[PDB]
């Protein structure tokens, strides 16, 4: 994503329990242990994006550098709107079977998901989403990977 | 037909018999006499009627003399 500055708000944003002003200097490879930026890997064969490791953004809803875990069902859909702030709307299509007429009909549903600043998503992109804890009234999913465009 | 089938119980001792056998069958056999009691509705009326008295409900004539 494109963010001009990290601190552009009334309060100060910082990762919880990450001590940042230490008198003694020690260099460690561990992300959060030594006192530098913290990150981990969610799993399910999903690789942490490179932009996360060196980025400076602060987010309490991103699956990376955040306090949210990815667990539950994993879904796919079609992106229809990405012009609001830190939230996307996805459309999923399927076929319902009517037994009496022995043929199908198409149906669709709309879904809302949270997009991390690590990724940059535009219209007409392939996405994979995973279940998470309630982040809002109608937001319960998080994007994990964006497939290349056709 | 001319055949009959039932159930039988044999006890080791008379005391084990009287200690374990049910009351209604004991009355059936006549070994012990029946208990005489009032009807269920009379007992129920007495029990719920005595819930309106406070302390020593066995005698409750002490409030009869309040009127003089």
């Amino acid at each position: 994503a494109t963010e001009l500055t990290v601190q552009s708000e009334r309060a100060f944003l910082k990762q919880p329990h990450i001590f940042l002003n230490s008198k003694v200097k020690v260099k460690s490879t561990r992300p959060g242990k030594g006192g530098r930026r913290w990150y981990k890997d969610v799993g399910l064969g999903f690789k942490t994006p490179k932009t996360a490791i060196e980025g400076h953004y602060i987010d309490k809803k991103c699956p990376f550098t955040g306090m949210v875990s990815i667990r539950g069902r994993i879904l796919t859909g079609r992106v229809v709107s990405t012009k609001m702030h830190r939230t996307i709307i996805i459309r999923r299509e399927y076929l319902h079977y009517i037994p009496k007429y022995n043929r199908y009909e198409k149906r669709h549903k709309n879904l809302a998901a949270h997009v991390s600043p690590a990724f940059r998503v535009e219209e007409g992109d392939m996405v994979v989403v995973g279940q998470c804890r309630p982040l809002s009234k109608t937001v319960r999913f998080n994007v994990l990977r964006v497939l290349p465009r056709t | 037909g001319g055949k009959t089938t039932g159930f039988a119980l044999i006890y080791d001792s008379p005391e084990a018999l009287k200690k374990f056998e049910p009351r209604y069958r004991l009355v059936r056999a006549g070994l012990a006499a029946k208990v005489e009691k009032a009807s269920r509705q009379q007992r129920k009326q007495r029990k719920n009627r005595l819930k309106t008295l406070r302390g020593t409900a066995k005698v409750k004539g002490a409030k009869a003399k309040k009127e003089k």
């Binding site: 799993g43 399910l44 064969g45 | 374990f20 049910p22």
Partner: protein
Amino acid sequence: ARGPKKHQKRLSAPSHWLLDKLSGAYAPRPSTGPHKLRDCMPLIVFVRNRLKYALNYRETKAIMMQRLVKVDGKVRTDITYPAGFMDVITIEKTGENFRLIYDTKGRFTVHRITDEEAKYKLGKVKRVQLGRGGVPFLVTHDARTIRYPDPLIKVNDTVKIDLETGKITDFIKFDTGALAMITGGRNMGRVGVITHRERHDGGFGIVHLKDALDNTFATRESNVFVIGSEKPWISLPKGKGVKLTIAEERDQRRARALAAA
């Protein structure tokens, strides 16, 4: 609904309890305890409906009052006490011991066992870790917790319990080539040897077993009950849990009937 329920309606009880649909409207409703409500064997049902020792309900609670019968070596005083898989009930006065174990048709059956070897059990571990103060501990399927275990023992294994001192005498690893019995699902009573295990990331793996008659079958890991690698430690009931189909079942009943008379 303003709290938890305390009554269980008859015609809704588990099928393997084998309760007649007539002769009453309610069921024993086993009390809370160490075993799951869905798959348990109430003591009143076992004593009255299987052994036929007690005629009806009234004397059933009188029978336990003399403390003659005990389970797992410890006396229990509630009539609706939930007994379960592998549990051993001991009656000293008559001189035999019973273990609650599934038959080949998926219900509890009476099974005589010898007194000298009927004095130990074995159960699967649910989770292993260190508790307060750094002391490691494990809990089995019958709510037995034991601290300071063998460090090689891991989750999903089974451990042999003495039942008198609660010490970890022996254990069985969970791997291919072991002999297991299924404890949940429709495949009740089968006995097989673990062939191989393939896991799916995200939970709910499946395992494939094979019967003595070259049959093949699969079941969830939560439903497998390993009782040995070879020569199972416990004594299996008659039939060894092989589940011959109805063709041989029909052949054998007339075969033994004609052989006897």
